[PDB]
Design an enzyme around this catalytic site. Sequence first.
Site, PDB file in Angstrom:
ATOM      1  N   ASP B  58     -73.198 -30.417  30.271  1.00 37.89           N
ATOM      2  CA  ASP B  58     -73.005 -29.127  30.924  1.00 37.89           C
ATOM      3  C   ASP B  58     -72.537 -28.095  29.902  1.00 37.89           C
ATOM      4  O   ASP B  58     -72.970 -26.935  29.913  1.00 37.89           O
ATOM      5  CB  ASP B  58     -71.959 -29.229  32.028  1.00 37.89           C
ATOM      6  CG  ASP B  58     -72.479 -29.912  33.280  1.00 37.89           C
ATOM      7  OD1 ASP B  58     -73.717 -29.887  33.507  1.00 37.89           O
ATOM      8  OD2 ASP B  58     -71.643 -30.449  34.046  1.00 37.89           O
ATOM      9  N   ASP B  74     -69.009 -32.591  31.051  1.00 40.67           N
ATOM     10  CA  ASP B  74     -69.768 -32.664  32.290  1.00 40.67           C
ATOM     11  C   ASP B  74     -68.770 -32.601  33.434  1.00 40.67           C
ATOM     12  O   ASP B  74     -67.784 -33.350  33.446  1.00 40.67           O
ATOM     13  CB  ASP B  74     -70.499 -34.011  32.336  1.00 40.67           C
ATOM     14  CG  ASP B  74     -71.971 -33.886  32.680  1.00 40.67           C
ATOM     15  OD1 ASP B  74     -72.795 -33.775  31.735  1.00 40.67           O
ATOM     16  OD2 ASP B  74     -72.300 -33.978  33.896  1.00 40.67           O
ATOM     17  N   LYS B  76     -67.921 -33.227  37.168  1.00 35.70           N
ATOM     18  CA  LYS B  76     -68.416 -34.094  38.214  1.00 35.70           C
ATOM     19  C   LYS B  76     -67.607 -33.748  39.433  1.00 35.70           C
ATOM     20  O   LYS B  76     -66.536 -33.159  39.291  1.00 35.70           O
ATOM     21  CB  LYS B  76     -68.204 -35.551  37.835  1.00 35.70           C
ATOM     22  CG  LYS B  76     -68.664 -35.889  36.428  1.00 35.70           C
ATOM     23  CD  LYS B  76     -70.010 -35.279  36.072  1.00 35.70           C
ATOM     24  CE  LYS B  76     -71.173 -36.157  36.463  1.00 35.70           C
ATOM     25  NZ  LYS B  76     -72.418 -35.657  35.800  1.00 35.70           N
TER      26      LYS B  76
END
Lengths: 215, 186
Positions: B58, B74, B76
């Site tokens: 990301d 990332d 989540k």
Amino acid sequence: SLRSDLINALYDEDVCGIISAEGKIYPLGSDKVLSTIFELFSRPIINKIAEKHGYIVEEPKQQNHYPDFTLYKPSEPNKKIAIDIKTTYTNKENEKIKFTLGGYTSFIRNNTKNIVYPFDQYIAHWIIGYVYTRVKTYNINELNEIPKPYKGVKVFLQDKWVIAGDLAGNIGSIHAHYKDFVEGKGIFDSEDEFLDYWRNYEKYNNISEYRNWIY
Amino acid sequence: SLRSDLINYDVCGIISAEGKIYPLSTIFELFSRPIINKIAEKHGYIVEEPKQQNHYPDFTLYKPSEPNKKIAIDIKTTYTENEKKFTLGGYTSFIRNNTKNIVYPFDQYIAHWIIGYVYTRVKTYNINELNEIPKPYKGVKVFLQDKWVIAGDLAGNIGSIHAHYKDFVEGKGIFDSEDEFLDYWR
């Protein structure tokens, strides 16, 4: 009718933040945020008009399912109405825009995959499209100061097929002016052709090539 | 240290210009980005996001001098109040073949962290009706842990351990090494 009532209702009714329990407000930007923002704004209006006409409005449980909203009369559940909300921006006013319109391998080919009710049960497929013009914390008194990610927002309600294109973006829509989506100016001739073209997409790479092939 | 300052959520509607609030996993990224930058610039790291969706990670972070010492992050999200997991990346792309679907060669990355979000799945309004709007989520907890320390031995994409949130924040998964994890997740 539910439809005319709905587009005018939409035409009437500028989100600028995320508000927290403690009163603080956070500005958005363009970073799937604006899409979700325009879907949220849409729920109320849809609920309002369906209800005024006696329609049940369902949203999907397994989210990834089409369509955003299914509307139907209980008297007639074989005539469900499907409303998908699409959002796109534009960096210059009066310059061609386009949308994505979802899967061409699921329900369109299987009748049941990734769609709420089986495909045959829907009589119409409406697209509500938002076209926005591309452009720390705050209190409730700063509302006009909190920097917005856009400087205008247009919206149309139209049939999926009438505005579908002949290329993958997930189906893409025609590459045309806001005006052409409102006016219903597309390339397919009928919904049948739109679905024959997309059920048979792998012979053809575009509409012209599609027709020679059907000959 | 990046992870340090880095390691150191009650939204309830979207607000309008004219005051109207519209009751409601993207707000969580929304909250994320600004903080990643602040701590990243506080250290001179270049933050970069993917130009194509479905790309890892990301956020990439690196100082312009060295690009073989990048960091991948990332965000989540997951939901349950006090119950039993995440979906991390995919085990066939960039991980099995160094350059498929990752913003930069896998070998440019010396770290892969996971900032994760956890909550319990619990008409327009006005400012005075503020504290009466019905929240669709309760109990948001968040953690910053290394991707490999978290990873499980079962696919859904590689799965994480299905444990309680504390096992996450402390790092109590099952592989004994980053090298053990990568070997396993081909």
